[PDB]
UniProtKB/Swiss-Prot annotation, chain A:
Family statement drawn from the similarity comment of this UniProt entry: Belongs to the Mediator complex subunit 7 family.
Subunit and interaction comment: Component of the Mediator complex, which is composed of MED1, MED4, MED6, MED7, MED8, MED9, MED10, MED11, MED12, MED13, MED13L, MED14, MED15, MED16, MED17, MED18, MED19, MED20, MED21, MED22, MED23, MED24, MED25, MED26, MED27, MED29, MED30, MED31, CCNC, CDK8 and CDC2L6/CDK11. The MED12, MED13, CCNC and CDK8 subunits form a distinct module termed the CDK8 module. Mediator containing the CDK8 module is less active than Mediator lacking this module in supporting transcriptional activation.
Function as written in the Swiss-Prot or TrEMBL entry: Component of the Mediator complex, a coactivator involved in the regulated transcription of nearly all RNA polymerase II-dependent genes. Mediator functions as a bridge to convey information from gene-specific regulatory proteins to the basal RNA polymerase II transcription machinery. Mediator is recruited to promoters by direct interactions with regulatory proteins and serves as a scaffold for the assembly of a functional preinitiation complex with RNA polymerase II and the general transcription factors.
Official protein name in the record: Mediator of RNA polymerase II transcription subunit 7
Localization annotation: Nucleus
Residue span relative to the full protein: 116 to 167 of 233
Gene that this polypeptide is encoded by: Med7
UniProt superkingdom: Eukaryota
UniProtKB/Swiss-Prot annotation, chain B:
Protein name: Mediator of RNA polymerase II transcription subunit 17
Biological role stated in the UniProt entry: Component of the Mediator complex, a coactivator involved in the regulated transcription of nearly all RNA polymerase II-dependent genes. Mediator functions as a bridge to convey information from gene-specific regulatory proteins to the basal RNA polymerase II transcription machinery. Mediator is recruited to promoters by direct interactions with regulatory proteins and serves as a scaffold for the assembly of a functional preinitiation complex with RNA polymerase II and the general transcription factors.
Origin: domain of life: Eukaryota
Subcellular location: Nucleus
Family: Belongs to the Mediator complex subunit 17 family.
Signal sequence region: none
Assembly: Component of the Mediator complex, which is composed of MED1, MED4, MED6, MED7, MED8, MED9, MED10, MED11, MED12, MED13, MED13L, MED14, MED15, MED16, MED17, MED18, MED19, MED20, MED21, MED22, MED23, MED24, MED25, MED26, MED27, MED29, MED30, MED31, CCNC, CDK8 and CDC2L6/CDK11. The MED12, MED13, CCNC and CDK8 subunits form a distinct module termed the CDK8 module. Mediator containing the CDK8 module is less active than Mediator lacking this module in supporting transcriptional activation.
From Swiss-Prot, chain C:
Encoding gene, per UniProt annotation: Med21
Organism annotation: Mus musculus (Mouse)
Family: Belongs to the Mediator complex subunit 21 family.
Subcellular location: Nucleus
Role this protein plays: Component of the Mediator complex, a coactivator involved in the regulated transcription of nearly all RNA polymerase II-dependent genes. Mediator functions as a bridge to convey information from gene-specific regulatory proteins to the basal RNA polymerase II transcription machinery. Mediator is recruited to promoters by direct interactions with regulatory proteins and serves as a scaffold for the assembly of a functional preinitiation complex with RNA polymerase II and the general transcription factors.
Portion of the full sequence shown: 66 to 128 of 144
Free-text tissue specificity from the UniProt record: Expressed in brain, heart, kidney, liver, lung, skeletal muscles, spleen and testis.
Assembly notes: Component of the Mediator complex, which is composed of MED1, MED4, MED6, MED7, MED8, MED9, MED10, MED11, MED12, MED13, MED13L, MED14, MED15, MED16, MED17, MED18, MED19, MED20, MED21, MED22, MED23, MED24, MED25, MED26, MED27, MED29, MED30, MED31, CCNC, CDK8 and CDC2L6/CDK11. The MED12, MED13, CCNC and CDK8 subunits form a distinct module termed the CDK8 module. Mediator containing the CDK8 module is less active than Mediator lacking this module in supporting transcriptional activation.
Name of the protein described by the UniProt record: Mediator of RNA polymerase II transcription subunit 21
From Swiss-Prot, chain D:
Coverage span on the entire protein: 80 to 129 of 270
Family in the record: Belongs to the Mediator complex subunit 4 family.
Subunit structure: Component of the Mediator complex, which is composed of MED1, MED4, MED6, MED7, MED8, MED9, MED10, MED11, MED12, MED13, MED13L, MED14, MED15, MED16, MED17, MED18, MED19, MED20, MED21, MED22, MED23, MED24, MED25, MED26, MED27, MED29, MED30, MED31, CCNC, CDK8 and CDC2L6/CDK11. The MED12, MED13, CCNC and CDK8 subunits form a distinct module termed the CDK8 module. Mediator containing the CDK8 module is less active than Mediator lacking this module in supporting transcriptional activation.
Native organism: Mus musculus
Location in the cell: Nucleus
Cited function: Component of the Mediator complex, a coactivator involved in the regulated transcription of nearly all RNA polymerase II-dependent genes. Mediator functions as a bridge to convey information from gene-specific regulatory proteins to the basal RNA polymerase II transcription machinery. Mediator is recruited to promoters by direct interactions with regulatory proteins and serves as a scaffold for the assembly of a functional preinitiation complex with RNA polymerase II and the general transcription factors.
Name under which the protein is recorded: Mediator of RNA polymerase II transcription subunit 4
Length: 52, 32, 63, 50
């Protein structure tokens, strides 16, 4: 029981830090993808505007 | 950082039209 | 016993003490702050583009 | 003669108005898509800001 508690206490902080880093990376990737999509949409809008 | 509470908020999400409708109903209720 | 030993050996060898986990969290927070600054710049650019498009639409409708 | 000239001018103005209406519809659709994208991005940013 003592060894199990020690292993749980040792594995909790590293797992939490890894999850936080993965969440930050996912948020950064989603923000970059949204920015690229908005840029492409604005380009298509300018193209459609200059079309007429 | 440390935003897992909102990052794992999978029912526990674009601009909801119902929220805008409720806000308009609260705003267009009277021209105070 | 073999499974317990292999799991304890291949477990996360890191923040059992108090320095490696703190350093990893600090590095992750710095990376998240940089990514948040980049995302804020991108979102400001996108909001400016959307505001310009909305102003153009309002001007077209005003005609 | 004035009625013929007015009919020609009305046809030209109707063509111009149809072109302007098509351009306005395209711009409105594009701005609506961009606004939905920006709203989703703002929601994600407010969620990740904590």
């Amino acid at each position: 029981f003592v060894h199990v508690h020690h292993l749980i206490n040792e594995y909790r902080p590293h797992q939490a830090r890894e999850t936080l880093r993965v969440m930050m990376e996912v948020q950064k990737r989603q923000r970059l993808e949204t920015a690229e999509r908005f840029q492409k949409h604005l380009e298509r809008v300018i193209e459609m505007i200059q079309n007429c | 950082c440390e935003k897992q509470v909102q990052e794992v908020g999978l029912d526990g999400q674009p601009l909801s039209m119902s929220q805008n409708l409720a806000r308009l109903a609260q705003r267009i209720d009277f021209s105070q | 016993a073999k499974d317990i030993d292999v799991l304890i050996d291949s477990l996360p060898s890191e923040e059992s003490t108090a320095a490696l986990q703190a350093a990893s969290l600090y590095k992750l927070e710095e990376e998240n702050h940089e990514a948040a600054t980049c995302l804020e710049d991108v979102v400001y650019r996108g909001d400016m583009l959307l505001e310009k498009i909305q102003s153009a639409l309002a001007d077209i409708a005003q005609s | 003669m004035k009625l013929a000239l007015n009919q020609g001018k009305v046809h030209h103005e109707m063509q111009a108005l149809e072109k302007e209406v098509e351009k306005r519809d395209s711009d409105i659709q594009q701005l609506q898509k961009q606004l939905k994208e920006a709203e989703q991005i703002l929601a994600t940013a407010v969620y990740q800001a904590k």
